[PDB]
Each structure stands twice: as structure tokens, then as C-alpha cells.
Amino acid sequence: MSLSEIKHWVFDMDGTLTIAVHDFAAIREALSIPAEDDILTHLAALPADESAAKHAWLLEHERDLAQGSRPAPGAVELVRELAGRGYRLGILTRNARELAHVTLEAIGLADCFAEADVLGRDEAPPKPHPGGLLKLAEAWDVSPSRMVMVGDYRFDLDCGRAAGTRTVLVNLPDNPWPELTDWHARDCAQLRDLLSAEGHH
Amino acid sequence: MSLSEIKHWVFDMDGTLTIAVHDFAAIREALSIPAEDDILTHLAALPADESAAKHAWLLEHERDLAQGSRPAPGAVELVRELAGRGYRLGILTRNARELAHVTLEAIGLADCFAEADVLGRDEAPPKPHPGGLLKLAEAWDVSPSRMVMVGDYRFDLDCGRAAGTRTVLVNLPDNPWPELTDWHARDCAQLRDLLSAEGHH
Numbered sequence: 568m569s570l571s572e573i574k575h576w577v578f579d580m581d582g583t584l585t586i587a588v589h590d591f592a593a594i595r596e597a598l599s600i601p602a603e604d605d606i607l608t609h610l611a612a613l614p615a616d617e618s619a620a621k622h623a624w625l626l627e628h629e630r631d632l633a634q635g636s637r638p639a640p641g642a643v644e645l646v647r648e649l650a651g652r653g654y655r656l657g658i659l660t661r662n663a664r665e666l667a668h669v670t671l672e673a674i675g676l677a678d679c680f681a682e683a684d685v686l687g688r689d690e691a692p693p694k695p696h697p698g699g700l701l702k703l704a705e706a707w708d709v710s711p712s713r714m715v716m717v718g719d720y721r722f723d724l725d726c727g728r729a730a731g732t733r734t735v736l737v738n739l740p741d742n743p744w745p746e747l748t749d750w751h752a753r754d755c756a757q758l759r760d761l762l763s764a765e766g767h768h
Numbered sequence: 769m770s771l772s773e774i775k776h777w778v779f780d781m782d783g784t785l786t787i788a789v790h791d792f793a794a795i796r797e798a799l800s801i802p803a804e805d806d807i808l809t810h811l812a813a814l815p816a817d818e819s820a821a822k823h824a825w826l827l828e829h830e831r832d833l834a835q836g837s838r839p840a841p842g843a844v845e846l847v848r849e850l851a852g853r854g855y856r857l858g859i860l861t862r863n864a865r866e867l868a869h870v871t872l873e874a875i876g877l878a879d880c881f882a883e884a885d886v887l888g889r890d891e892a893p894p895k896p897h898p899g900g901l902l903k904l905a906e907a908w909d910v911s912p913s914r915m916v917m918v919g920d921y922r923f924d925l926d927c928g929r930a931a932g933t934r935t936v937l938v939n940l941p942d943n944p945w946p947e948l949t950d951w952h953a954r955d956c957a958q959l960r961d962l963l964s965a966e967g968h969h
Contacts, residue, residue: 582828589827597922599944607820611812619808620941620954621841622823626790628921630828720829721798740821743800755822757793768939 569766570750573733575707575714576649579701580660580667582719583737583755584646585636585701586675594625616768641756648759650679652765655707657684659691659699659716661725693723695764700732715749724748770967771951772936776908777850778901778916781861781868784938785847786837786875786954794833795826836906839875840939842957849960851880856908858885860892860917860927862899896926901933916950918959925949 569659578584598621600609610618625632649656656679660667664687671677671685684703691699704711716727719738724747726735736744736751737758752758779785792807799822801810811819826833850857857880861868862950865888872878872886885904890930905912917928920939925948928935936953937945953959 582825586824587828597944598938598940608816611819615809617941618812620939622808623787624783624920624940626827626830627788629827631921641958719825721794721831738821739798739819739825740779741800743798 569716570762571766573713573715574652575655575657575709576647576705577657577659577703577714578717579716579718579720579723580617580658580662580670581636582606582639583717583723584639584642584658584676585661585670586639586738586763587627587629587634587723588635588637598622636670640754641759643674645759645762646676646679647757648762655684655709657686657703657707659686659694660701661688661693663688663689673743677725694722695729697726697730700726700730704730704732734766771916771963772967774906774914774916775853776856776858776910778858778860778904778915778917778933779847780793780814780919780921780924781863781871782837783840784918784924785840785843785859785877786871787840787883787939788830789836789838791831798825798829812841821932837871840956842960843955844875844877846956846960846963847877847880849963856885856910857881858887858904858908860887860895860904862889862894864889882959895923896930898927898931901927901931905931905933922948 575696591629594606600606610621646656658667658680659754664685667685667687671680686699691702700711700716704714711731714732715735716723717735717737719726721744722734724734724744729748733749734747735758737755738750740753742748742751748762752761801807811822844896847857849882859868859881865886868886868888872881887900890952901912901917905915912932916936917924917933917939918936919925920937922945925935925937925945929948934950935948936959937949937958938956941954943949943952951962953962
């Protein structure tokens with residue numbers, strides 16, 4: 568109802584707490600981007616067919632260009648804020664738990680989640696099946712209506728709706744699935760601001 | 769020297785002969801693209817920060833949105849033209865051979881390559897190590913100088929240069945690695961045109 572009244576928070580990993588990063592130097596070389604230009608800005612200014620070919624190449628080679636992941640904007644700050652309140656935090660991800668654990672350690676958030684509450688590939692059916700959120704709801708003995716699922720992709724929102732949890736979209740700037748989305752924020756930093764302000768006027 | 773004098777052709781698979789395709793309806797929904805607009809054109813017309821957020825999301829979710837692959841523009845036509853001349857054709861790919869074989873069958877090109885000349889994950893060291901092209905050079909008993917490696921990514925061109933083969937870049941519209949690239953074409957269809965015209969005036 569009010570966001571701050573939710574004391575049980577579940578996050579997706581990829582796209583929500585962490586984001587893939589890519590080899591900028593390799594992109595600039597392949598796409599002939601001048602050093603003085605931003606990659607995206609430069610591509611948007613090119614003739615349409617040239618821009619299209621170069622964007623297609625970039626998407627085609629996303630895995631070739633990837634260089635691991637970094638925390639998403641505001642993600643660390645938001646998780647630390649929630650943990651500081653004594654809120655219960657979980658993860659629901661397609662990633663193997665061991666890989667999720669390693670990622671959490673790398674971004675300095677491993678102490679914010681009980682290990683049993685990090686649900687990976689082997690702990691839950693694939694999204695948008697509700698099983699993983701129900702597992703957390705059971706472990707926490709809490710109404711799903713008093714939980715929030717935080718994600719950046721339609722399967723996260725569908726998973727929340729299927730389990731009966733509230734839903735937050737982060738990491739898109741607008742509200743593309745309004746019926747599936749209880750709150751939306753451009754990123755985890757705006758979400759933390761929303762949390763701070765809502766029902767506190 | 770003249771492109772038509774090369775009678776031994778090696779292709780990369782991903783990015784050269786086939787390209788990943790993606791779920792347009794899912795992209796349009798997530799990025800709030802109107803039906804009357806092209807996705808890329810619409811994104812380029814958005815305010816800079818909004819465009820940046822949406823392009824980042826698209827790259828982040830490239831694998832989530834993927835729906836297998838299709839032949840790259842002109843790829844089928846080019847391979848059939850070369851096979852029709854009686855030229856010897858090979859593949860050098862990171863993909864498992866069994867997966868490459870299945871892909872070749874799907875795009876109707878399996879009859880254009882001897883099965884032993886399709887080199888996958890288990891048949892050759894990772895690009896840009898020259899081993900795979902040397903394997904083909906040996907099997908064909910041909911000077912690498914009389915072979916061409918066709919690709920769309922720097923490791924393909926580096927692999928060709930390391931083995932001593934000629935090199936072609938396809939599927940980018942310009943010439944970003946001029947010292948690594950013997951011929952360049954926007955796609956396999958322009959390459960087929962180049963083949964047809966060069967040294968024939």
C-alpha cells in the first residue's frame with residue numbers, strides 16, 4: 568500500500584542489482600567512433616542505414632563485448648538502506664546460486680541477504696512461475712501482499728503478480744506495463760528516494 | 769590478389785552467415801514504441817537520456833530477447849554462388865560442430881561444405897589463434913595466401929592475418945580495421961557483387 572510499509576524485499580540480479588558492462592575501446596574501434604564523441608550520441612547522429620547497421624552489430628556481439636558486470640546505479644545504496652532498517656531481503660534469479668553468491672561478495676552486499684534467501688537456478692522454477700517467491704513467502708511466513716518483487720523485465724513483474732506480491736520496475740525510465748507494476752523508478756536510486764518520500768508528507 | 773582468383777573460402781558462422789534475431793513485439797512493449805514507428809528510428813528521436821536508458825536495456829537483455837538466428841543478408845546467395853563455381857568452402861566457428869551442422873541444415877547450406885571442413889569448438893583453438901585456418905590449409909593443401917577468411921569481428925581478421933590468409937570484413941558498412949582487412953563489403957550480397965566485378969572490366 569505505502570512502499571515503506573513493505574518490510575520484505577526480493578530482487579532480480581541481472582538487470583536490477585547488477586548490469587553487464589562492455590568493452591568500450593573495442594566498440595569504438597569496430598564502430599569507428601571518434602574519441603571526442605559518446606558512442607550512443609555519435610551513432611544517433613549517423614545516417615539512418617549506417618546507424619542501423621552499427622546498432623545491429625552491437626546487439627549481435629553483446630556477449631563477445633561483455634566484460635563481466637557492475638552494480639546498477641543506486642543498487643548498493645538501496646540494499647544497504649533496506650538492510651539498515653532491519654528489512655528482510657531476498658534474491659530470485661535464473662543464475663546458479665554459487666554464481667549469485669560470488670557476485671554479491673564482489674559488490675559488497677553478501678552480508679545483506681541470508682544465504683538461504685538467495686534463490687538461484689536450482690532453488691526455484693523459471694520465472695514467471697511463482698514458486699520462488701512463494702518459497703520466500705513461506706520461509707518468511709509473510710503475506711505476499713506485504714512483499715515486493717523488484718525487477719527490470721516483464722517476467723519479474725509477471726512472477727510478482729502470479730505470486731501475489733507487490734511489484735517494482737527499475738532501470739527503465741517510464742511505465743511500460745502499468746497493470747503489472749505497483750511502483751516504478753528510473754533506477755534503484757530513485758526507488759530509494761520514492762521509499763523515503765511516499766506516505767511521509 | 770584479385771578476389772575471384774581465391775578458390776578456397778572460410779566463413780565465421782555467427783555474425784557472418786547467420787545473425788541473431790530478437791523478439792520485436794517484446795522490445796516494442798518494454799520500450800514503449802508506437803506501432804507506426806521503427807524501433808531504432810523511434811529511439812534515436814527520443815531525448816538523449818531516455819534513448820540511452822532504453823538502448824542500455826536492449827543490450828542488457830539481448831539474450832533474454834533472442835529467438836534463434838536467421839541467415840545474414842546475401843549469405844545464402846553468396847555461398848550458393850561460390851559452391852556453384854566448384855570452390856572449396858569451410859567454416860571456422862566457436863560453436864560446437866553439431867550445432868553448426870544443425871544451423872547449416874536449417875538455412876539450406878549443409879550441402880555446400882564438406883563435413884570435415886566445418887570446424888567448431890572441438891576442432892580448432894579459439895580465435896584469433898591461427899590453428900583452425902591452418903587445419904583447413906593443410907586439408908586443402910593450399911597456400912594460405914590463396915584462401916580468404918570471411919568475418920564480421922576483429923578476431924576473424926586477426927585469425928586470418930595470423931594464418932597468412934586473405935581477409936574480408938562483412939556486416940559493417942565501412943572499414944574500421946584497414947590494415948587487417950583485404951576486402952570489405954556491407955554484407956554478403958555486396959561481397960558477391962564485388963567478387964563478380966573485381967578484375968573483370
